[PDB]
Amino acid sequence: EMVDNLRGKSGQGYYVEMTVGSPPQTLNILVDTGSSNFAVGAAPHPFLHRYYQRQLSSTYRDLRKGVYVPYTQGKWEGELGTDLVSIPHGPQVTVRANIAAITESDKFFIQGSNWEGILGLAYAEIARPDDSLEPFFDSLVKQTHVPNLFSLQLCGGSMIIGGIDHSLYTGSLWYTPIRREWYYEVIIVRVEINGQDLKMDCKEYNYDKSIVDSGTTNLRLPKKVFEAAVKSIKAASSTEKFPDGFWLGEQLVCWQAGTTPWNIFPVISLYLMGEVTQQSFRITILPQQYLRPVEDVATSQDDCYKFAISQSSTGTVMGAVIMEGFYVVFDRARKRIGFAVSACHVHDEFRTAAVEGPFVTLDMEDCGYN
Numbered sequence: 001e002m003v004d005n006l007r008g009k010s011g012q013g014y015y016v017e018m019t020v021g022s023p024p025q026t027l028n029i030l031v032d033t034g035s036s037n038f039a040v041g042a043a044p045h046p047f048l049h050r051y052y053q054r055q056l057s058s059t060y061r062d063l064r065k066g067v068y069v070p071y072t073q074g075k076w077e078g079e080l081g082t083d084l085v086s087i088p089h090g091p092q093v094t095v096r097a098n099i100a101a102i103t104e105s106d107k108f109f110i111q112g113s114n115w116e117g118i119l120g121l122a123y124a125e126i127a128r129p130d131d132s133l134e135p136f137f138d139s140l141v142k143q144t145h146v147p148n149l150f151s152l153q154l155c156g157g158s159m160i161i162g163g164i165d166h167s168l169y170t171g172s173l174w175y176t177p178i179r180r181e182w183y184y185e186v187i188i189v190r191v192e193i194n195g196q197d198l199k200m201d202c203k204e205y206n207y208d209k210s211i212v213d214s215g216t217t218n219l220r221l222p223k224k225v226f227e228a229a230v231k232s233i234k235a236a237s238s239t240e241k242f243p244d245g246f247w248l249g250e251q252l253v254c255w256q257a258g259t260t261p262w263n264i265f266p267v268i269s270l271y272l273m274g275e276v277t278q279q280s281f282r283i284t285i286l287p288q289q290y291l292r293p294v295e296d297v298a299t300s301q302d303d304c305y306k307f308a309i310s311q312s313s314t315g316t317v318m319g320a321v322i323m324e325g326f327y328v329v330f331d332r333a334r335k336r337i338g339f340a341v342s343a344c345h346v347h348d349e350f351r352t353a354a355v356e357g358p359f360v361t362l363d364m365e366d367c368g369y370n
């Protein structure tokens, strides 16, 4: 009953239905493994179809403390409190959780996105104002008998809370360690573009951290890695030449409907640290993932795309574009993240997204930046 409980797209996020308060107020909440605050619109906003009304909830408790949260994209401020929370298409439980009532915001809410709030699924270490503000998932686990694990199949999609749904993936689940419990931090040991190694000291891939982040759209790479990757992707696709603006995400690329030349763009393989010394596995993604479709009836004689790999000065972010088509298990209990090919893997008649291993490195270097 938890299958297909997500709606949305990489560009504007994936969201799950929740209720807050007593009597229950229904809100759509973006699922974000890249933050740790649970927050809902709690005042009128041009892009909000609805919002949390604390005055109507008899179970609302004000903590008399304000909070401010900046993201890569957008920021908000609100008032902290607690209230009862349920998930209609998740486990049938009711938890009292911390909730930030958003009363001011800038470039956070998205026009026509259909969500009114955000569920930060990462660890307390990155919650605001500080790590004493217990995150929702921790409250869920402490107060119910729900196992300390969840999985995401982003396609719509599914969030399976408390376990793994085997009908959502094929083949093997490969696990990479959670290096530190704050973000879901992982380690990338190798990057290939069409099978060709970028030939970088592997610490560069994780400067200064690498995270798995359902709340970010793009694959975001450290500048040095980004430049190397774009150079290689340009070379692989050189049968066609695009404006610099495209590679910077400042411009769409369009082809006549149905003629997108997928085959001129390379596959990208990210090798993740395994659970055993010097072993790794790889996930391979196709251009169908990193060229993000931009829907617009005005342009619809064409199919148009944005380049969904971009630069970062705060480390690698494996965003929704990377997670799409994979079944990703956030196994908090065992401090590891699992990857498998999803029931909604994309692929065409020549190539397929994949998760495969084991691979061995002869290099003993630790790829962690710190």
Ligand SMILES: CCNc1cc(C(=O)N[C@@H](Cc2ccccc2)[C@H](O)CN[C@@H](C)C(=O)NC2CCCCC2)cc(N2CCCC2=O)c1
Pocket (backbone or CB within 6 Å): 010, 011, 012, 013, 030, 032, 034, 035, 036, 069, 070, 071, 072, 073, 074, 107, 108, 109, 118, 126, 127, 128, 213, 215, 216, 217, 218, 219, 220, 310, 317, 319
């Ligand atoms: C889905 C919307 N698209 C979209 C969203 C973000 C973004 O900032 N998402 C946040 C959630 C969100 C979701 C929807 C709307 C706003 C924010 C995540 O929480 C980001 N996670 C890490 C990187 C972070 O900054 N965490 C903070 C650390 C400090 C304490 C609080 C958590 C970034 C891009 N970007 C920016 C450049 C390339 C890209 O894809 C596109």
